Amino acid sequence: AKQRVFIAGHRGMVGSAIRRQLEQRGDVELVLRTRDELNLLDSRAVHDFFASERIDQVYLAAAKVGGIVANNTYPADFIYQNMMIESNIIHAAHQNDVNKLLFLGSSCIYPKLAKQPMAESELLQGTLEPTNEPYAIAKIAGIKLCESYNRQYGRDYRSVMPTNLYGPHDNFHPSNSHVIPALLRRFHEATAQKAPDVVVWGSGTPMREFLHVDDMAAASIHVMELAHEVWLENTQPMLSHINVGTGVDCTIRELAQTIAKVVGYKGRVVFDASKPDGTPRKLLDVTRLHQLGWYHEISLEAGLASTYQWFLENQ
Amino acid sequence: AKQRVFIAGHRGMVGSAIRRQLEQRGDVELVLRTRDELNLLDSRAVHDFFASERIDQVYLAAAKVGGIVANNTYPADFIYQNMMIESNIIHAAHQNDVNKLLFLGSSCIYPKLAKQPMAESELLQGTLEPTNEPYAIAKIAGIKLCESYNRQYGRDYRSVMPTNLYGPHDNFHPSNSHVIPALLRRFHEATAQKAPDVVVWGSGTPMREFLHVDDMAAASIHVMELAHEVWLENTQPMLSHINVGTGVDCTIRELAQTIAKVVGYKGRVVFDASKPDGTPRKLLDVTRLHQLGWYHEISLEAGLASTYQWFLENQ
Ligand SMILES: NC(=O)c1ccc[n+]([C@@H]2O[C@H](COP(=O)([O-])OP(=O)(O)OC[C@H]3O[C@@H](n4cnc5c(N)ncnc54)[C@H](OP(=O)(O)O)[C@@H]3O)[C@@H](O)[C@H]2O)c1
Numbered sequence: 001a002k003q004r005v006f007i008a009g010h011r012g013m014v015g016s017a018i019r020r021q022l023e024q025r026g027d028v029e030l031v032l033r034t035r036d037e038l039n040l041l042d043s044r045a046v047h048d049f050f051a052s053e054r055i056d057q058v059y060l061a062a063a064k065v066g067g068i069v070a071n072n073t074y075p076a077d078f079i080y081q082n083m084m085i086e087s088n089i090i091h092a093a094h095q096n097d098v099n100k101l102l103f104l105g106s107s108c109i110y111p112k113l114a115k116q117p118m119a120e121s122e123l124l125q126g127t128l129e130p131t132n133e134p135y136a137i138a139k140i141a142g143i144k145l146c147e148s149y150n151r152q153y154g155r156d157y158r159s160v161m162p163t164n165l166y167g168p169h170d171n172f173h174p175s176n177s178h179v180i181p182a183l184l185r186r187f188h189e190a191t192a193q194k195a196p197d198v199v200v201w202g203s204g205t206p207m208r209e210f211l212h213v214d215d216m217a218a219a220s221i222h223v224m225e226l227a228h229e230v231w232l233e234n235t236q237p238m239l240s241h242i243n244v245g246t247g248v249d250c251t252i253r254e255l256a257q258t259i260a261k262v263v264g265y266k267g268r269v270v271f272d273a274s275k276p277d278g279t280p281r282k283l284l285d286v287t288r289l290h291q292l293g294w295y296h297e298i299s300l301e302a303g304l305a306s307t308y309q310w311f312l313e314n315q
Numbered sequence: 316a317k318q319r320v321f322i323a324g325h326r327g328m329v330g331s332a333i334r335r336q337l338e339q340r341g342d343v344e345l346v347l348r349t350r351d352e353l354n355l356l357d358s359r360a361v362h363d364f365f366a367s368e369r370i371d372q373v374y375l376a377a378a379k380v381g382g383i384v385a386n387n388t389y390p391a392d393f394i395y396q397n398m399m400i401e402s403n404i405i406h407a408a409h410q411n412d413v414n415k416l417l418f419l420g421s422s423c424i425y426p427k428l429a430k431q432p433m434a435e436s437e438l439l440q441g442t443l444e445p446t447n448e449p450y451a452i453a454k455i456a457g458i459k460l461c462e463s464y465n466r467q468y469g470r471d472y473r474s475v476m477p478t479n480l481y482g483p484h485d486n487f488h489p490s491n492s493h494v495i496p497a498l499l500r501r502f503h504e505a506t507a508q509k510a511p512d513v514v515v516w517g518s519g520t521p522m523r524e525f526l527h528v529d530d531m532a533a534a535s536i537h538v539m540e541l542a543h544e545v546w547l548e549n550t551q552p553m554l555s556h557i558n559v560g561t562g563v564d565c566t567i568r569e570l571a572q573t574i575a576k577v578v579g580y581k582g583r584v585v586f587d588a589s590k591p592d593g594t595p596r597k598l599l600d601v602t603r604l605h606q607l608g609w610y611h612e613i614s615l616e617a618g619l620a621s622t623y624q625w626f627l628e629n630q
């Protein structure tokens with residue numbers, strides 16, 4: 001009997017990445033519902049789905065996600081919708097004897113002034129970035145729902161905290177606040193237009209971390225499928241999440257120059273240092289994941305190149 | 316037209332305190348539903364109630380609450396039920412054009428190693444007490460739901476963070492982890508039995524803060540009814556909650572000796588200092604509330620005496 005695996009949010013960036021890998025697995029039967037078929041905000045509908053579809057495992061990749069403008073403009077929508085989706089799925093899963101779930105956090109969940117690189121223990125150690133506060137609180141509440149169900153009911157609801165992601169199915173619009181898809185699109189257009197330069201705000205000095213979504217999906221399946229005793233040995237019940245990333249930083253400068261090369265731009269990348277930089281360094285400590293035997297396979301250069309080719313095929 | 320005021324959880328300790336004060340108000344029409352009439356976990360039922368009952372203001376005093384054993388034994392129930400009750404009420408209120416709401420936090424929401432006395436700005440500055448973590452995360456999510464609805468939709472969803480409360484309608488069982496009702500009952504029984512001593516764990520040295528629930532209710536109505544511009548001047552949109560307490564500490568020793576006197580116990584109060592004390596001091600900074608023009612009226616001695624008389628009438 002193949003395991004029946006529900007990938008919530010399977011048309012999303014991360015959900016689709018997990019689907020492309022599991023779609024290859026003869027030991028897995030995927031159960032998929034679009035938003036039109038199942039509105040994850042509707043408690044009744046979510047319970048009815050779990051009460052009729054005989055699910056074994058859930059990948060919780062459904063969420064209301066956006067960039068800086070969206071998070072500051074629709075804060076109520078970000079906190080409410082994520083709290084409801086998470087609560088409805090985790091509670092319905094439990095009520096229907098679904099023992100295995102993988103929840104997705106976000107690195108934006110860590111305190112603004114966290115110690116770098118950020119180990120899992122940085123969670124809740126200080127105040128949040130205001131732009132992401134509503135979203136972050138709902139994501140932290142999701143982790144704590146999983147841990148609470150694990151502790152009270154002996155569930156196996158695991159969680160992963162990705163770093164910045166990029167890859168197929170992203171939003172490739174020049175005004176995206178997420179730097180990889182924005183820069184890919186900006187450099188693509190500047191290359192098409194023969195623009196003499198592309199100006200990036202800031203000095204280029206801050207160090208950040210990036211992981212291709214197919215690596216994220218692989219790590220998530222890896223973490224989901226570890227035997228429970230191994231997962232327990234490398235986590236704590238009230239500190240259960242696992243950072244997923246490279247553990248390696250690169251300057252914004254390096255990233256922009258690499259994107260320029262990947263797209264074949266021959267103008268100048270220019271940084272405007274009159275605009276402020278964020279903190280000097282932000283990256284995850286991925287010791288737990290590496291101790292668990294998973295290491296990322298996609299280098300930045302290779303991942304940016306394949307991402308750009310996906311964009312070119314999907315304009 | 317009297318304001319139509321829904322007191323969610325009106326048979327609870329705090330809800331009933333607010334009801335006893337508003338029941339005197341000819342400018343207010345109370346709308347009350349017991350749990351059997353309206354299950355606040357049921358999104359559909361909550362929306363239907365708001366879509367039919369023409370509410371002007373909500374006091375959100377419904378919650379899953381307990382002591383140390385309950386919070387550690389049923390963590391999933393504490394986080395899930397509080398997230399759902401809060402989400403359902405705040406979202407339904409907003410969808411039905413209910414502009415005014417008062418949410419109740421809890422002082423247990425502050426970081427374990429917070430700076431004392433704890434100003435509102437201590438929220439989220441550090442890790443939580445593990446016993447209360449699930450509950451605390453759902454309460455913090457409730458504050459952040461209110462702030463997000465205020466920011467996105469221009470609502471007036473205010474919040475109060477009470478200190479330790481005591482008074483009528485508490486749980487007066489000797490094994491209650493809440494020290495006032497437990498000690499009242501233990502000393503009452505030791506007085507009835509002529510027991511030679513009553514032994515309290517710990518040294519008696521820690522300093523804590525206590526507020527009678529009728530003072531809490533008065534402060535909550537006060538905060539609810541301030542003009543918006545005054546409330547805005549004394550809060551910030553993403554730091555909106557108001558501590559409610561005395562701002563004055565007393566040792567556990569003082570509290571126990573006072574309870575002994577109030578009950579007329581003539582045996583010895585004994586502290587067993589072989590058992591550990593918690594942190595040396597925990598109390599709220601109530602500068603915001605005092606600046607808002609509210610000061611508590613019930614002294615510890617007077618409040619303990621009237622609480623004990625309520626117990627004696629309700630055994
Ligand atoms: N670097 C990081 O730290 C990082 C970055 C990205 C993602 N992640 C994690 O991955 C999660 C997903 O991100 P993503 O980039 O894959 O988001 P996404 O591409 O925006 O996908 C989320 C999916 O959820 C669905 N969804 C939302 N509300 C739903 C509802 N009410 N009913 C049913 N489906 C609903 C979607 O449908 P519609 O579009 O039709 O609404 C969308 O397909 C994030 O929340 C975060 O936990 C973390």
Ligand SMILES: NC(=O)c1ccc[n+]([C@@H]2O[C@H](COP(=O)([O-])OP(=O)(O)OC[C@H]3O[C@@H](n4cnc5c(N)ncnc54)[C@H](OP(=O)(O)O)[C@@H]3O)[C@@H](O)[C@H]2O)c1
Nearest residue numbers: 324326327328329355377378419420421422477478479480
């Ligand atoms: N010192 C402090 O910091 C402190 C202390 C106490 C309270 N407070 C605040 O006051 C809040 C209330 O505390 P409390 O002591 O008044 O609690 P309580 O006495 O236990 O009352 C809560 C009320 O909510 C109701 N309720 C719970 N789930 C419901 C549901 N699904 N549908 C409808 N009604 C439901 C109740 O009904 P049932 O009993 O029938 O379940 C109970 O009447 C706390 O959450 C906290 O925010 C803070």
